[PDB]
């Protein structure tokens, strides 16, 4: 019987549940400490050793064509090769490689090992002006309405800074700026001092025109540069909340069972909060509430929320897939 | 240590993940616009400059022997040479060449540059009668049951046109035909006017016997000829949905981890929809639902779905490969 | 500009992809049927018309010095000439020639036309005893450990036949022998009847000492002689699986991009299965699994897997080649 | 029909492939052992029986005018005759002859039989000083930039020996020298003892001014004299790698099909490695990497790489040749 029972199954009767995917425990370690954040000094000194076309091309392959690269080689380390990276060995142009690491769900990672989340965080923190000039937005930003918020940002943040607080909230951001100037580590001072000499252009305040473009490649946490600038980390929290809102709307739209509705939604604000508060900061929730009052409605009015397929078509095709797979084998049929 | 660590690795400890393939960013550009479709006027005037044996032989090497040509020289431009193409320089028969371009996953392409998808689209749109006469079906059509749908197409589409809609659906296709006769661009008018004078035989409606043979070489999108014929583009969407259904059944059949099940399935309907709606059309989903109700069951009953190897054999051989590769080097072992 | 653009290029800008090799469609036909196997009655009656020194010398030039002959004249027909072949025209010793045909990747072939795969199949099926006596193994057998499996074959197959099945598996092979004695064509009966009178020594069972030597010259499919002997065709499938295992290990060892890792591995078991099942047989997978359990480990322990060059040397030299070729012309630089 | 079919063709229809050259199996033996290297004791005692003008003149006809001699009489043994070689039979000056043997691709050779590769190896190992004095470089050395590496060799190797290793690498070569003084055969001791009494001047180390001139006549393997001198065999491997690099650049430059690009490149390092490791040595790859870091760039900067003919001219002429040959006969047209 092809759908009877597998070898090595330890129960003689067929279970009521169908079989599923195999969890590979080879790439997992146990002996790591429970809190092991990124180093962020080794990562910035590594990524500032390169020349910016290979960095922007790797950012393009991880953001705009990111789903294809994560579908092709996930669970392995990737070498990036370009003509612009050199190793001058007596005139021979030996290629220098960029190493990212695309981890699995079951995968212990090192402290300085660069995931694509860490890479997008570091590159979007270092070079926002080139991302602004090249209009390089990831598709996960493009579905929550990043483009309409970035059409007229120089007037948008000027109208936001002129609103009265509950004096305008420029004074509130200035008080936040003094509170962060008292409360910062020397590690971020080393990061700013190093990246200034590396040659990237810094950002002084949220009033800069290339300020929303720090979150254009959708980093997983706020970058170490533009951390103590008093109004940027809360703006990344605002965009993470918009991502979770879109995921809950898309999870509630789909007719289906309980576990796939639960599977379709995501927890981005929890991970953003954990990874941001781990860097020595306290997110003020009041500023996030100010952004939600300011442009929470226009973003949700400009979500994507596209119905991809006719539901009568999808139901019929998925039913036919399910009948065929339950005829052939004993696996759980995947979704169309 | 041969499996210790590579040179230029920037972390002193061995990572938990094995190394993988190198992504070459040399053939990628950034400064292209975000939407740059094909020209389709330059491509038709280029491919109608040739003589049909070199076109049908290149179609044979891209469809029937397509996997071997994409394995041999991928990431480069291919010259096709045949005796039938001339350049009469004072009697000297200088060979004229056909240029296709087989792109990589990391590769920006021009507007008029001919990929094999564009080539199969243009050739299958121009010359369906010779493909019908020579019985030239690609192996990706041969696994989703194209042959049994093309055995008796003249009676099949006659029984489909006689069914009552929810008057028969001939009136629905005629209303669709009037709606497309109002809504069409002058560019497709130029394509039809040019390809009529070039000498290829047109198709007037879906009732023609060489109508299913437009999708015999499996184009990536529906061709510019046979676009405004009201019932052909939805039939290509139906075949793309059949391809995605077969890929999901084959992905659910395989015992294995999550990422290789996700790697084995494909997204053909998304690309077909994007590339078809980019040409100035709106696919009516109702006609696709009509085709799925009509012959969705017979196609899935006639899928290939062949078990290629004994799974006990494949598991044993792949385990032995994995043990040997993990003994020798630090790369990720490929699948048998 | 020498690297600017070629004549006859139909696009004014330089493409991102470099140019590649020319595919010659002159030797390809379209009007062949989709399934056209070899005749195998004309081929055996042709190759038994000759005298065995010219056959063994042509087998030597196609197996042991086969890479040089396929590099020199590929895509053409080869005349083999020796003093031992005669045409007695009134005492004049006119030389008789052996015609093989080394086809290209783009090349339609006739039914009775002898490729080197067909030639190695026919010669290794007819004369295994002389190949055993002369120790004539091809280098593609020599890398998958054919010599250690052929050191002590008379004791090896005796220990395999004495193992208990899941009664020993001699009874299983005898049941397979009865099933093949019921199921065989008269064409193979004509082949055995003809080649017995031609003068070659037959093989009765797998217990013969010259039984592994049928696959010493590495045929592409199992020979028509020694087809219905119940245990030989599965042994050729076992050796084809060993070839694919070595090719996947060698493809996974090499640091490089995705398409050249995909290019380095081979699909030998698919072609062996297609060409063997086309001759009127059904390969029992259980016997192949028995061989993999029996001596799958010793063969993989005795693969060649030789690191040909220091990788630091190869990387440096290939980088220098790539820089020079990208300076000179617009072609894709070949591998060192 | 002159292009219809040949007599003795065994297939009634014309094949798609054109006919090619005849492989002559007369000069091939089968019963040789699989490893039969040169004797190198008989060859040195044979070539030291002569007087050096006939040796240098035969070296001139095999290196500098070598292509003409291999075009004229290939596949046969050559007698070399000069006035300087005697046979004193009671005062009569009977001429003594030098016998070389120019073998075919299909040709078994004896152990002591002198091919031109063996001859160039022995003569360039015995007499480097006269080759230095007469400036006798082969044209295959002249295209990979031997002259610029041999302009200032006494300062070049002095700057190489003074570089620090990873202490300078003189200590590394001295450690290699001690390792070879422990590991050498008595056969090479007999060769050095015999050739010292024959009258040729030995070489003590790589620091000698006539040290690069051992590889001026381009031997096929490193000579038996100057084998255990710790730094000379790796220098011959370096020059063989330069030959393979030039052949791959010239193979990638040519527009054409796949098999002639594959035909134009050569495998010299494989044959050099096989024939050198067969003499009882282990090539250290580190020294070859040191030479590639040292003067890999200057040699490739001084390759010949000459475009012999205008490609528009060559394409037109070759097309006209191909049309005429396909009109006349059924052979494959040769390249212009």
Author numbering:
A (entry chain D), B (entry chain D), C (entry chain D), D (entry chain D): 80 to 245, 260 to 429
From the paper:
Expression of recombinant full-length HTNV-NP in insect cells led to formation of recombinant NCs that have a diameter consistent with native NCs. Cryo-EM images collected on a Titan Krios enabled structural determination of HTNV-NC at 3.3 Å resolution. HTNV-NC is a left-handed helix with a pitch of 68.03 Å and 3.6 subunits per turn. As a result, Nt- and Ctarm of the same subunit embrace each other: residues 97–98 of Ntarm contact residues 423–424 of Ctarm, revealing a unique intra-arms interaction specific to HTNV-NC. The two β-strands of the hairpin (residues 155–160 and 177–181) interact with the Ntarm residues 101–103 from the following subunit to form a 3-stranded β-sheet. In addition, the β-hairpin152-181 tip (residues 162–175) acts as a clamp and seals the C-terminus-mediated contacts between NPi+2 (residues 409 to 419) and NPi+3 (residues 385–390), thereby buttressing and rigidifying the metastable helical form of the HTNV-NC. Consistently, three nucleotides with a partial occupancy can be visualised for each NP. Conserved residues R197, R314, R368, R146 and K153 interact via salt bridges with RNA phosphates, in line with the versatility of RNA sequence to be incorporated by NP. The nucleotides bind in a continuous positively charged groove oriented towards the interior of the NC.
In particular, the Hantaviridae family comprises the virus Hantaan (HTNV) that gives rise to haemorrhagic fevers with renal syndrome and the virus Sin Nombre that is linked to severe pulmonary illnesses with fatality rates up to 40%. The Bunyavirales genome is usually divided into three RNA segments enwrapped by the viral nucleoproteins (NP). The resulting nucleocapsids (NCs) protect the genome and serve as a replication/transcription template for the viral polymerase. In this context, HTNV-NCs are intriguing as they were shown to be able to form rather rigid helices of 10 nm diameter within viruses and during cell infection.
